[PDB]
Amino acid sequence: MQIFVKTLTGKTITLEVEPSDTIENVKAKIQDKEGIPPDQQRLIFAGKQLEDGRTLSDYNIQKESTLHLVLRL
Template structure:
């Protein structure tokens, strides 16, 4: 299996990898271009500067963006017991992109999907790696809870 540090900006294997003080990894060119436009980390919005960047030689810490470059399969299970598989999933895939695949397969609009993994509701802007997905992981698909308060006018009959 091949491993590399993933750039949070281009989502590719980082070239000339560097990390910020907040711990996020990037391609040197990607983060330098980013910092020409913004002084905030693109991931956590912490203030960072070019002189705070550190070259990565080895980065093997739990939770760091070291990723497998291979795709894997995840499963989606509905409340009715149906199951579908999503092939070619990658740890960098966003939950939003997973919802797009589910919508194509089931017809259920993304806005009505709630995805649960390990007891947590998945957020659209996060990635599979943020939740610790790996080959064979199972997501539970449930519909959005519909709520609200209905008001009815009650009139007395004569």
């Protein structure tokens, strides 16, 4: 798979993921790229703030889907 993540700073990064990857897992990949703590990370999928425990599959996030990164820091 692949998806896209977005930063208010415009900054659009891509990511590699697995269908069953958790949001905590997506956050871990963001922390790698943007070095931003997962607990200061809030992901939104098409206007929905994603829950750390559920997986990309639950939120029906398929390939090429875009999540917007919001920081609760």
